Design a protein around this nucleic acid. Structure first.
Ligand SMILES: [K+]
Ligand SMILES: [K+]
Ligand SMILES: [Mg+2]
Ligand SMILES: [Mg+2]
Ligand SMILES: [Mg+2]
Ligand SMILES: [Mg+2]
Ligand SMILES: [Mg+2]
Ligand SMILES: [Mg+2]
Ligand SMILES: [Mg+2]
Ligand SMILES: [Mg+2]
Ligand SMILES: [Mg+2]
Ligand SMILES: [Mg+2]
Ligand SMILES: [Mg+2]
Ligand SMILES: [Mg+2]
Ligand SMILES: [Mg+2]
Ligand SMILES: [Mg+2]
Ligand SMILES: [Mg+2]
Ligand SMILES: [Mg+2]
Ligand SMILES: [Mg+2]
Ligand SMILES: [Mg+2]
Ligand SMILES: [Mg+2]
Ligand SMILES: [Mg+2]
Ligand SMILES: [Mg+2]
Ligand SMILES: [Mg+2]
Ligand SMILES: [Mg+2]
Ligand SMILES: [Mg+2]
Ligand SMILES: [Mg+2]
Ligand SMILES: [Mg+2]
Ligand SMILES: [Mg+2]
Ligand SMILES: [Mg+2]
Ligand SMILES: [Mg+2]
Ligand SMILES: [Mg+2]
Ligand SMILES: [Mg+2]
Ligand SMILES: [Mg+2]
Ligand SMILES: [Mg+2]
Ligand SMILES: [Mg+2]
Ligand SMILES: [Mg+2]
Ligand SMILES: [Mg+2]
Ligand SMILES: [Mg+2]
Ligand SMILES: [Mg+2]
Ligand SMILES: [Mg+2]
Ligand SMILES: [Mg+2]
Ligand SMILES: [Mg+2]
Ligand SMILES: [Mg+2]
Ligand SMILES: [Mg+2]
Ligand SMILES: [Mg+2]
Ligand SMILES: [Mg+2]
Ligand SMILES: [Mg+2]
Ligand SMILES: [Mg+2]
Ligand SMILES: [Mg+2]
Ligand SMILES: [Mg+2]
Ligand SMILES: [Mg+2]
Ligand SMILES: [Mg+2]
Ligand SMILES: [Mg+2]
Ligand SMILES: [Mg+2]
Ligand SMILES: [Mg+2]
Ligand SMILES: [Mg+2]
Ligand SMILES: [Mg+2]
Ligand SMILES: [Mg+2]
Ligand SMILES: [Mg+2]
Ligand SMILES: [Mg+2]
Ligand SMILES: [Mg+2]
Ligand SMILES: [Mg+2]
Ligand SMILES: [Mg+2]
Ligand SMILES: [Mg+2]
Ligand SMILES: [Mg+2]
Ligand SMILES: [Mg+2]
Ligand SMILES: [Mg+2]
Ligand SMILES: [Mg+2]
Ligand SMILES: [Mg+2]
Ligand SMILES: [Mg+2]
Ligand SMILES: [Mg+2]
Ligand SMILES: [Mg+2]
Ligand SMILES: [Mg+2]
Ligand SMILES: [Mg+2]
Ligand SMILES: [Mg+2]
Ligand SMILES: [Mg+2]
Ligand SMILES: [Mg+2]
Ligand SMILES: [Mg+2]
Ligand SMILES: [Mg+2]
Ligand SMILES: [Mg+2]
Ligand SMILES: [Mg+2]
Ligand SMILES: [Mg+2]
Ligand SMILES: [Mg+2]
Ligand SMILES: [Mg+2]
Ligand SMILES: [Mg+2]
Ligand SMILES: [Mg+2]
Ligand SMILES: [Mg+2]
Ligand SMILES: [Mg+2]
Ligand SMILES: [Mg+2]
Ligand SMILES: [Mg+2]
Ligand SMILES: [Mg+2]
Ligand SMILES: [Mg+2]
Ligand SMILES: [Mg+2]
Ligand SMILES: [Mg+2]
Ligand SMILES: [Mg+2]
Ligand SMILES: [Mg+2]
Ligand SMILES: [Mg+2]
Ligand SMILES: [Mg+2]
Ligand SMILES: [Mg+2]
Ligand SMILES: [Mg+2]
Ligand SMILES: [Mg+2]
Ligand SMILES: [Mg+2]
Ligand SMILES: [Mg+2]
Ligand SMILES: [Mg+2]
Ligand SMILES: [Mg+2]
Ligand SMILES: [Mg+2]
Ligand SMILES: [Mg+2]
Ligand SMILES: [Mg+2]
Ligand SMILES: [Mg+2]
Ligand SMILES: [Mg+2]
Ligand SMILES: [Mg+2]
Ligand SMILES: [Mg+2]
Ligand SMILES: [Mg+2]
Ligand SMILES: [Mg+2]
Ligand SMILES: [Mg+2]
Ligand SMILES: [Mg+2]
Ligand SMILES: [Mg+2]
Ligand SMILES: [Mg+2]
Ligand SMILES: [Mg+2]
Ligand SMILES: [Mg+2]
Ligand SMILES: [Mg+2]
Ligand SMILES: [Mg+2]
Ligand SMILES: [Mg+2]
Ligand SMILES: [Mg+2]
Ligand SMILES: [Mg+2]
Ligand SMILES: [Mg+2]
Ligand SMILES: [Mg+2]
Ligand SMILES: [Mg+2]
Ligand SMILES: [Mg+2]
Ligand SMILES: [Mg+2]
Ligand SMILES: [Mg+2]
Ligand SMILES: [Mg+2]
Ligand SMILES: [Mg+2]
Ligand SMILES: [Mg+2]
Ligand SMILES: [Mg+2]
Ligand SMILES: [Mg+2]
Ligand SMILES: [Mg+2]
Ligand SMILES: [Mg+2]
Ligand SMILES: [Mg+2]
Ligand SMILES: [Mg+2]
Ligand SMILES: [Mg+2]
Ligand SMILES: [Mg+2]
Ligand SMILES: [Mg+2]
Ligand SMILES: [Mg+2]
Ligand SMILES: [Mg+2]
Ligand SMILES: [Mg+2]
Ligand SMILES: [Mg+2]
Ligand SMILES: [Mg+2]
Ligand SMILES: [Mg+2]
Ligand SMILES: [Mg+2]
Ligand SMILES: [Mg+2]
Ligand SMILES: [Mg+2]
Ligand SMILES: [Mg+2]
Ligand SMILES: [Mg+2]
Ligand SMILES: [Mg+2]
Ligand SMILES: [Mg+2]
Ligand SMILES: [Mg+2]
Ligand SMILES: [Mg+2]
Ligand SMILES: [Mg+2]
Ligand SMILES: [Mg+2]
Ligand SMILES: [Mg+2]
Ligand SMILES: [Mg+2]
Ligand SMILES: [Mg+2]
Ligand SMILES: [Mg+2]
Ligand SMILES: [Mg+2]
Ligand SMILES: [Mg+2]
Ligand SMILES: [Mg+2]
Ligand SMILES: [Mg+2]
Ligand SMILES: [Mg+2]
Ligand SMILES: [Mg+2]
Ligand SMILES: [Mg+2]
Ligand SMILES: [Mg+2]
Ligand SMILES: [Mg+2]
Ligand SMILES: [Mg+2]
Ligand SMILES: [Mg+2]
Ligand SMILES: [Mg+2]
Ligand SMILES: [Mg+2]
Ligand SMILES: [Mg+2]
Ligand SMILES: [Mg+2]
Ligand SMILES: [Mg+2]
Ligand SMILES: [Mg+2]
Ligand SMILES: [Mg+2]
Ligand SMILES: [Mg+2]
Ligand SMILES: [Mg+2]
Ligand SMILES: [Mg+2]
Ligand SMILES: [Mg+2]
Ligand SMILES: [Mg+2]
Ligand SMILES: [Mg+2]
Ligand SMILES: [Mg+2]
Ligand SMILES: [Mg+2]
Ligand SMILES: [Mg+2]
Ligand SMILES: [Mg+2]
Ligand SMILES: [Mg+2]
Ligand SMILES: [Mg+2]
Ligand SMILES: [Mg+2]
Ligand SMILES: [Mg+2]
Ligand SMILES: [Mg+2]
Ligand SMILES: [Mg+2]
Ligand SMILES: [Mg+2]
Ligand SMILES: [Mg+2]
Ligand SMILES: [Mg+2]
Ligand SMILES: [Mg+2]
Ligand SMILES: [Mg+2]
Ligand SMILES: [Mg+2]
Ligand SMILES: [Mg+2]
Ligand SMILES: [Mg+2]
Ligand SMILES: [Mg+2]
Ligand SMILES: [Mg+2]
Ligand SMILES: [Mg+2]
Ligand SMILES: [Mg+2]
Ligand SMILES: [Mg+2]
Ligand SMILES: [Mg+2]
Ligand SMILES: [Mg+2]
Ligand SMILES: [Mg+2]
Ligand SMILES: [Mg+2]
Ligand SMILES: [Mg+2]
Ligand SMILES: [Mg+2]
Ligand SMILES: [Mg+2]
Ligand SMILES: [Mg+2]
Ligand SMILES: [Mg+2]
Ligand SMILES: [Mg+2]
Ligand SMILES: [Mg+2]
Ligand SMILES: [Mg+2]
Ligand SMILES: [Mg+2]
Ligand SMILES: [Mg+2]
Ligand SMILES: [Mg+2]
Ligand SMILES: [Mg+2]
Ligand SMILES: [Mg+2]
Ligand SMILES: [Mg+2]
Ligand SMILES: [Mg+2]
Ligand SMILES: [Mg+2]
Ligand SMILES: [Mg+2]
Ligand SMILES: [Mg+2]
Ligand SMILES: [Mg+2]
Ligand SMILES: [Mg+2]
Ligand SMILES: [Mg+2]
Ligand SMILES: [Mg+2]
Ligand SMILES: [Mg+2]
Ligand SMILES: [Mg+2]
Ligand SMILES: [Mg+2]
Ligand SMILES: [Mg+2]
Ligand SMILES: [Mg+2]
Ligand SMILES: [Mg+2]
Ligand SMILES: [Mg+2]
Ligand SMILES: [Mg+2]
Ligand SMILES: [Mg+2]
Ligand SMILES: [Mg+2]
Ligand SMILES: [Mg+2]
Ligand SMILES: [Mg+2]
Ligand SMILES: [Mg+2]
Ligand SMILES: [Mg+2]
Ligand SMILES: [Mg+2]
Ligand SMILES: [Mg+2]
Ligand SMILES: [Mg+2]
Ligand SMILES: [Mg+2]
Ligand SMILES: [Mg+2]
Ligand SMILES: [Mg+2]
Ligand SMILES: [Mg+2]
Ligand SMILES: [Mg+2]
Ligand SMILES: [Mg+2]
Ligand SMILES: [Mg+2]
Ligand SMILES: [Mg+2]
Ligand SMILES: [Mg+2]
Ligand SMILES: [Mg+2]
Ligand SMILES: [Mg+2]
Lengths: 275, 48
RNA sequence: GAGCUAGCCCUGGCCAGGGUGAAGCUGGGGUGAGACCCAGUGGAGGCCCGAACCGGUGGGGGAUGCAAACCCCUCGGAUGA
RNA sequence: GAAUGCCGGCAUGAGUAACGAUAAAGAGGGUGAGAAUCCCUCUCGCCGUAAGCCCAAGGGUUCCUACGCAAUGGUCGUCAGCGUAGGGUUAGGCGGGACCUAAGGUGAAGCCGAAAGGCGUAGCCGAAGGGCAGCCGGUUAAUAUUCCGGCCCUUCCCGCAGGUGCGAUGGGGGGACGCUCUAGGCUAGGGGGACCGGAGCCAUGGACGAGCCCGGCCAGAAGCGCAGGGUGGGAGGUAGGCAAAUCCGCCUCCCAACAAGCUCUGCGUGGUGGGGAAGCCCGGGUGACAACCCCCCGAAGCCAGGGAGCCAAGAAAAGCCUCUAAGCACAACCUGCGGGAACCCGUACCGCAAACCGACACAGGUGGGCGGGUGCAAGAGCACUCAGGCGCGCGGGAGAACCCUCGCCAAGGAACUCUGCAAGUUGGCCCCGUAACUUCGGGAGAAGGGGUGCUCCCUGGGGUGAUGAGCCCCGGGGAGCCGCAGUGAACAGGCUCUGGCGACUGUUUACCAAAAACACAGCUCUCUGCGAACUCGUAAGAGGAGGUAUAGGGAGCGACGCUUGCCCGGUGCCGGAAGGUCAAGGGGAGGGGUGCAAGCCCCGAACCGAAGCCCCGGUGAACGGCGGCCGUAACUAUAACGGUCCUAAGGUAGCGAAAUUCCUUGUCGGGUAAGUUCCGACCUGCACGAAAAGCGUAACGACCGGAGCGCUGUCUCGGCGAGGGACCCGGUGAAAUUGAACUGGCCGUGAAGAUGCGGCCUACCCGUGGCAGGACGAAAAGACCCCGUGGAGCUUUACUGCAGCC
RNA sequence: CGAUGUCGGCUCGUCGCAUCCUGGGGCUGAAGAAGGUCCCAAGGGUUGGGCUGUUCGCCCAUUAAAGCGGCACGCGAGCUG
RNA sequence: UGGGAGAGGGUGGUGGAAUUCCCGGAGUAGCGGUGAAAUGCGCAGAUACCGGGAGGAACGCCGAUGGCGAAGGCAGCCAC
RNA sequence: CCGAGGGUAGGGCCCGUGACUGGGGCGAAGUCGUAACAAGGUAGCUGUACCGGAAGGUGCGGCUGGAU
RNA sequence: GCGGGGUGGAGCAGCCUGGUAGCUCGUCGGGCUCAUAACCCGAAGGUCGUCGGUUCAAAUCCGGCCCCCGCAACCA
């Protein structure tokens, strides 16, 4: 339930912040954090390869456990639910009965102090992690491996999910957060339930400064530059696009599909995305 | 106002220094050239 | 050639003193329970006034200058992008 | 002899401007060949959150002393950051290295690239971050946490004793963390003392006083005391911490918990060791057996890794502790004590500046710490002032114009002007009081007003102390005194009404534009299923992101409210396995060259044959576009209505002479005595219109218009005054410019604007202060304009290529 | 074109006369008063405001009158911008 | 106190029929629509037919002149 | 001291008037259509929504004051 | 200054490419209806802005003229 403010400044008029109700622990597990190198959008050549980046809050990266076949059959208790500044979702702290501690992303409804588990024999229950072939049809599911033993790739952002439509051979049919129908291998692990923090998209950043805190630097329209800079540059006074609207690098940016036509995974997509 | 020369001995030596020149093809050519011309110092003097 | 300047990275430092009084919390009233109201406590903010510091709005001086951009009087921000 | 030639020399302007902050000087005495300028003394003025003091950077002998004054110093110089010489910088504890890691750099492995080279794990390097043992005083002309004195501490080696399963580059803990606000207790620092110590002083009318003036401390091991930080103890199981593990993690049981105990810091005390003023006498000596105490204010610093709240969620690695592994347990490690050992580099001086960066001893720039007192509500603000440091390296006169900076002004009060430009006014605090409108926050310091000093009397509350005295911080009431005036000096909003643009705080053309531009939260379209798209790269490799569609790229629009109409014929994009066209290649009807021939060689039609293109559809918050003529109503006028031509479809809502309106100062209304501007309406909108968004919008603005109140030297209309210049004298002494010059006016003439030619007129020679009409004055080989088959930036359905993609 | 600064304003004037006013005349469809038209005449005078960058022009309130032109659309080594 | 009827309300669950669309099959010259047509859809293989899949919405028969509620109104079935 | 009232400033209510603008009422013989009364030739009314020269039309749900 | 246009009463074809003036509405006569409109059956009306030329022949092709709408008028 997103939190509002009274309009005691201009910016507080519409600023909203998360309610943080699900959070039960406020500093990270020291043995599970490691320093996050901020890149400023610069690659190893020193060159900005992603414009408009940098200057946000310092962060510690929290090591998340996207493979859970690492510990099949060993149940864990849910020790805490904690704020992760590297992802939109909240992460859960797990104490396995082994004593090993680990981080997962916390699905919706996950209760601090409950048992979760992974493996082909796990109960169909929010937090458990089976290979896709053992999850029943019609189940909402998250943190889905794309390929077996490669890592949870799909449905990781706040509130997102994937639903199992049917099985077809060594393969199941997933409807992704995007609406596409894909064939993912049945031996790919997933996690029953949808990712938590579904209110995350109702946040109103509220003012320019809040975007600077998140590492977002101001983004200048092409239409505001000079021809040496952007297809939309120049013009006496304002100006319509005066050509098919284009990126800084020339290519059209309203409708031009950019997926590679001959990509091997095309044999595994049943329908492109909705909407 | 703030002019353009703000001396710094570490910056002077890590930029124009002897070892900075030897590490690079163009740098070795500077030394070869200043040596062939007969320069007394091949490299800025900085007191370290 | 980035010892000027523009951006980013890492690590440190700086921001006198006043002002306003958000949420919450405590109590009181209210109701079937509530919303909600009031008082206190509280100390929020690209909040208000103003040094340092950062600026450069208006005018005047300077114009073989004190200065290849300066001086004076005014003025902007000053917990923040 | 000419090239705005080149190099050098010397002229002109000229004894001219200038001599670098308007903080400020005067006298006496020294020294010396020579003194406004050096030294000393007295008087005066200036800085005092500095114009004082201490670090760092950078500079590199500039430091101290003696002897010098040719050049340097904007003058002088006997002086100096100058010349010559001699001297001077001392560390186990400060800083850095023999320690650790950050970005980044480098890089055994490995990957890539014609060559050069580019990447890259661990590792290594890399600091103003971590870690780590010295405080006070004295001494030199010049160094001092470095020498000396006192009291302390660290590491390494060896030895002795006691204890112990010892042992690491390996496991674990810890190191280890943000922003705002903040408790308790301290210290630093400061104010007072009728208490203690002090050379003295009594003036000029009074004062021998509970008088004036001066001072009243620093450091310190163990122990102890006050305040804090850190920390659970035992046991059983154990499958995780990439071998092991008694450590660590997880499970269960007992006991202990706002404690206590152990541990570690800060403060106080502490054996001792220091220091110690005015004033007088020549840096010193005395003062002096100096005294060294009480109360109060009190940190932003200390305890510290403290507490709370919040979201944007806040380094690493070593030192250190623990666990064990090989190994070894005659060893090794831990504790205590002793003797020995302890290296390299920096250390002078300047350091908001005359020694650094600006060609200069340059009104500019330069990071950190200390920064005292009184008063003004507070403070680092402001005035004065301590300690300390200075009067700015040309002076002496004079008392014009004129310029600058400043003060005042009769009556009027914006009449000035493009514009109240500028300068007035207002101004702090306390209380009274405060409108439209609003998104209910605001608008608001709205507006407007009243108070403000001194004295005596009564009195309420807090802090410390003790509950009292004293001190200290908030106040309340009554009666009075004085002046023109009580935030009596200095620092410190003029206000209101109304439009346009932009929501707002923000950002911008360093050095003519700060805005209405850029950004912005927010809205929409579109791409992207992850070895993502996209971007940089020949590549490997990176960024994206150790992210995963509530995510990331691109594009437009730009808070918010109410909204965003019609056109898919053209262009773009999306979809479309048909058909049409289509390169290499396949195919090989049919020819040709040659040879005696087998054969070798070349041409080659039908037909099969991708993408792209046509062809069929979709698509506007994609590129974009959204008509013309004619007629019609029972006064007139005007047409709801009709007719016809064209379109892909003919502009919807809402706005409108507008940042858009040409005709235009449109017409009417308001404001004014008067209104090409302004505000409100009208609508034949030259040429508004809906995300190059349409119409509004409280709040905000060093934006741009219009009005009014206040107040004024802006003005009628100027006057007087101040200081710094200008002027005169002594010293030092430029500049651009310059064909040569013995360089007048008129009317003509002339390459059409004449000091220089003609005619007339006028004028004795040479300067000084002034003014700017001319010398088509100076400056800059016109930016405008053209010319050149000159150049460069930019665009596209110009040509032709290329990367990239298919 | 190896530069002749370009509107207007301010300041400061100076000249011409095709005379706005003031002085002198003739004619009048001049009764007086006040006008009209032409002649002579350049000595002096020729206001303050609203609007607009404006020159000009309109408007307010006066006036004896509110003249028209030249001087590089007089005058930026005199100012403004 | 003991009992009864009920589409009374709220939550969660779930059952078949149908329409649309998508993929496979088989199949060809029209489908659709109307007063009649036309637009439209269809040899780029539609309509009609079978099998599979996705998704949303509404509950046929019972059903009544019926029942419940204060009204607005409440209908597959199941539990609370 | 209080004190008629005077003066500066800011509010509230009423009244009059105002370029222009909105619908309303009325007016012997105006222009356009034909919405309603018959099933008024699409049954009518209705709350709301959007649209359109105009009456109106259409969507959603409601009423019989609906005919056969 | 560059461009397009002028033809029955209204709005438009024919002009390029010489010989043939056409379409919708309107107007006139009749029909239907009680009557009007709509509707049905028929008819008239254009010497093609103008003067001049080319030609056997000019709406048509070429000139001058009148007109009626447009696009433009920039560097100072
Ligand atoms: K030009
Ligand atoms: K010229
Ligand atoms: Mg809010
Ligand atoms: Mg939460
Ligand atoms: Mg760590
Ligand atoms: Mg990264
Ligand atoms: Mg590089
Ligand atoms: Mg980018
Ligand atoms: Mg970037
Ligand atoms: Mg999170
Ligand atoms: Mg995420
Ligand atoms: Mg798969
Ligand atoms: Mg969002
Ligand atoms: Mg961030
Ligand atoms: Mg932008
Ligand atoms: Mg632009
Ligand atoms: Mg631009
Ligand atoms: Mg560029
Ligand atoms: Mg371009
Ligand atoms: Mg463009
Ligand atoms: Mg532009
Ligand atoms: Mg532009
Ligand atoms: Mg434009
Ligand atoms: Mg556009
Ligand atoms: Mg255009
Ligand atoms: Mg265009
Ligand atoms: Mg383009
Ligand atoms: Mg591309
Ligand atoms: Mg897809
Ligand atoms: Mg600078
Ligand atoms: Mg620098
Ligand atoms: Mg350095
Ligand atoms: Mg350094
Ligand atoms: Mg450096
Ligand atoms: Mg640097
Ligand atoms: Mg380098
Ligand atoms: Mg080097
Ligand atoms: Mg070499
Ligand atoms: Mg040299
Ligand atoms: Mg040599
Ligand atoms: Mg070199
Ligand atoms: Mg630097
Ligand atoms: Mg501050
Ligand atoms: Mg206040
Ligand atoms: Mg309060
Ligand atoms: Mg609280
Ligand atoms: Mg602020
Ligand atoms: Mg402010
Ligand atoms: Mg204030
Ligand atoms: Mg300035
Ligand atoms: Mg001013
Ligand atoms: Mg200059
Ligand atoms: Mg200045
Ligand atoms: Mg000032
Ligand atoms: Mg200010
Ligand atoms: Mg401020
Ligand atoms: Mg402040
Ligand atoms: Mg010659
Ligand atoms: Mg030359
Ligand atoms: Mg020369
Ligand atoms: Mg020479
Ligand atoms: Mg010579
Ligand atoms: Mg010479
Ligand atoms: Mg000479
Ligand atoms: Mg001379
Ligand atoms: Mg001279
Ligand atoms: Mg002179
Ligand atoms: Mg000079
Ligand atoms: Mg000077
Ligand atoms: Mg000064
Ligand atoms: Mg001064
Ligand atoms: Mg002063
Ligand atoms: Mg004297
Ligand atoms: Mg001498
Ligand atoms: Mg002297
Ligand atoms: Mg002398
Ligand atoms: Mg002096
Ligand atoms: Mg002296
Ligand atoms: Mg002071
Ligand atoms: Mg000074
Ligand atoms: Mg130097
Ligand atoms: Mg000398
Ligand atoms: Mg001498
Ligand atoms: Mg000598
Ligand atoms: Mg000299
Ligand atoms: Mg000298
Ligand atoms: Mg000098
Ligand atoms: Mg001398
Ligand atoms: Mg020395
Ligand atoms: Mg020592
Ligand atoms: Mg050694
Ligand atoms: Mg190291
Ligand atoms: Mg390398
Ligand atoms: Mg090489
Ligand atoms: Mg190499
Ligand atoms: Mg290095
Ligand atoms: Mg190192
Ligand atoms: Mg260090
Ligand atoms: Mg040390
Ligand atoms: Mg010590
Ligand atoms: Mg000392
Ligand atoms: Mg051990
Ligand atoms: Mg170890
Ligand atoms: Mg930690
Ligand atoms: Mg941490
Ligand atoms: Mg740190
Ligand atoms: Mg915060
Ligand atoms: Mg102390
Ligand atoms: Mg004090
Ligand atoms: Mg287990
Ligand atoms: Mg003694
Ligand atoms: Mg501080
Ligand atoms: Mg602390
Ligand atoms: Mg804490
Ligand atoms: Mg690291
Ligand atoms: Mg062994
Ligand atoms: Mg042994
Ligand atoms: Mg031991
Ligand atoms: Mg050594
Ligand atoms: Mg030293
Ligand atoms: Mg110093
Ligand atoms: Mg300074
Ligand atoms: Mg400093
Ligand atoms: Mg100094
Ligand atoms: Mg000095
Ligand atoms: Mg120097
Ligand atoms: Mg300079
Ligand atoms: Mg000086
Ligand atoms: Mg200086
Ligand atoms: Mg003091
Ligand atoms: Mg104060
Ligand atoms: Mg000094
Ligand atoms: Mg004089
Ligand atoms: Mg005064
Ligand atoms: Mg006056
Ligand atoms: Mg006035
Ligand atoms: Mg007045
Ligand atoms: Mg005015
Ligand atoms: Mg202006
Ligand atoms: Mg002003
Ligand atoms: Mg009002
Ligand atoms: Mg108002
Ligand atoms: Mg309000
Ligand atoms: Mg107030
Ligand atoms: Mg007030
Ligand atoms: Mg206001
Ligand atoms: Mg009073
Ligand atoms: Mg007094
Ligand atoms: Mg003041
Ligand atoms: Mg103020
Ligand atoms: Mg306007
Ligand atoms: Mg703005
Ligand atoms: Mg706007
Ligand atoms: Mg806006
Ligand atoms: Mg904005
Ligand atoms: Mg701000
Ligand atoms: Mg600029
Ligand atoms: Mg510029
Ligand atoms: Mg510049
Ligand atoms: Mg520049
Ligand atoms: Mg400027
Ligand atoms: Mg600008
Ligand atoms: Mg500004
Ligand atoms: Mg918006
Ligand atoms: Mg590239
Ligand atoms: Mg590439
Ligand atoms: Mg990564
Ligand atoms: Mg923008
Ligand atoms: Mg639109
Ligand atoms: Mg279209
Ligand atoms: Mg189309
Ligand atoms: Mg299209
Ligand atoms: Mg053959
Ligand atoms: Mg093809
Ligand atoms: Mg178009
Ligand atoms: Mg267009
Ligand atoms: Mg009529
Ligand atoms: Mg509309
Ligand atoms: Mg208009
Ligand atoms: Mg107007
Ligand atoms: Mg407008
Ligand atoms: Mg405009
Ligand atoms: Mg317009
Ligand atoms: Mg015009
Ligand atoms: Mg106009
Ligand atoms: Mg005009
Ligand atoms: Mg007018
Ligand atoms: Mg009109
Ligand atoms: Mg507004
Ligand atoms: Mg507003
Ligand atoms: Mg602003
Ligand atoms: Mg502004
Ligand atoms: Mg104004
Ligand atoms: Mg005004
Ligand atoms: Mg004056
Ligand atoms: Mg004077
Ligand atoms: Mg004289
Ligand atoms: Mg000299
Ligand atoms: Mg010269
Ligand atoms: Mg001569
Ligand atoms: Mg002469
Ligand atoms: Mg003469
Ligand atoms: Mg001539
Ligand atoms: Mg002449
Ligand atoms: Mg002559
Ligand atoms: Mg001559
Ligand atoms: Mg002659
Ligand atoms: Mg002559
Ligand atoms: Mg002559
Ligand atoms: Mg004469
Ligand atoms: Mg003169
Ligand atoms: Mg002159
Ligand atoms: Mg002049
Ligand atoms: Mg001249
Ligand atoms: Mg001149
Ligand atoms: Mg040249
Ligand atoms: Mg030239
Ligand atoms: Mg030229
Ligand atoms: Mg030039
Ligand atoms: Mg030209
Ligand atoms: Mg050519
Ligand atoms: Mg040529
Ligand atoms: Mg060319
Ligand atoms: Mg260029
Ligand atoms: Mg070129
Ligand atoms: Mg010249
Ligand atoms: Mg010139
Ligand atoms: Mg004037
Ligand atoms: Mg007369
Ligand atoms: Mg007569
Ligand atoms: Mg008469
Ligand atoms: Mg006259
Ligand atoms: Mg005018
Ligand atoms: Mg003119
Ligand atoms: Mg005019
Ligand atoms: Mg008269
Ligand atoms: Mg004139
Ligand atoms: Mg001229
Ligand atoms: Mg001139
Ligand atoms: Mg002229
Ligand atoms: Mg000028
Ligand atoms: Mg001028
Ligand atoms: Mg002029
Ligand atoms: Mg001149
Ligand atoms: Mg201008
Ligand atoms: Mg200006
Ligand atoms: Mg067909
Ligand atoms: Mg076929
Ligand atoms: Mg769907
Ligand atoms: Mg009274
Ligand atoms: Mg009275
Ligand atoms: Mg009254
Ligand atoms: Mg009807
Ligand atoms: Mg009907
Ligand atoms: Mg009908
Ligand atoms: Mg009807
Ligand atoms: Mg309709
Ligand atoms: Mg006609
Ligand atoms: Mg036609
Ligand atoms: Mg034709
Ligand atoms: Mg023909
Ligand atoms: Mg009839
Ligand atoms: Mg003819
Ligand atoms: Mg003929
Ligand atoms: Mg041009
Ligand atoms: Mg011009």
């Amino acid at each position: 339930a997103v939190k509002k403010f009274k309009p005691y400044t201009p910016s507080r008029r519409f600023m909203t912040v998360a309610d943080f109700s699900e959070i039960t622990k406020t500093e990270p597990e020291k043995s599970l954090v490691k320093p996050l190198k901020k890149t400023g959008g610069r690659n190893n050549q020193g060159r900005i390869t992603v414009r408009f980046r940098g200057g946000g809050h310092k962060r510690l990266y929290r090591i998340i456990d996207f493979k859970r076949w690492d510990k099949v059959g060993i149940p864990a208790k849910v020790a805490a639910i904690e704020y992760d500044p590297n992802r939109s979702a909240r992460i859960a702290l797990l104490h396995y009965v082994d004593g090993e501690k680990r981080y997962i992303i916390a699905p919706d409804g996950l209760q601090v102090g409950q048992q979760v588990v992974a493996g082909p024999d796990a109960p169909i229950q929010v937090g458990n992690a089976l290979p896709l072939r053992f999850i029943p049809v019609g189940t909402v599911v998250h943190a889905v491996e794309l390929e077996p033993k490669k890592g949870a790739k799909l449905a990781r952002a706040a509130g997102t999910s994937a639903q199992i439509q049917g099985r077809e051979g060594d393969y199941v049919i997933l409807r992704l957060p995007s609406g596409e129908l894909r064939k993912v291998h049945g031996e790919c692990y997933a996690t029953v339930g949808a990712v938590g923090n579904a209110d995350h998209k109702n946040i109103v950043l509220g003012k320019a400064g809040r975007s600077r805190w998140l590492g977002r630097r101001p983004h200048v329209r092409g239409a505001a530059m000079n021809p040496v800079d952007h297809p939309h540059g120049g013009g006496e006074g304002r100006a319509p696009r005066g050509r098919p609207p284009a990126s800084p690098w020339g290519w059209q940016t309203k409708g031009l599909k950019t997926r590679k036509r001959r990509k091997p995974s095309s044999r595994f997509i049943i329908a492109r995305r909705k909407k | 106002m703030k002019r353009t020369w703000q001396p710094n001995r570490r910056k002077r030596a890590k930029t124009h220094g002897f070892r900075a020149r030897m590490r690079t093809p163009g740098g070795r050519k500077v030394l070869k050239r200043r040596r062939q011309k007969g320069r007394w110092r091949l490299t800025p003097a900085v007191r370290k």
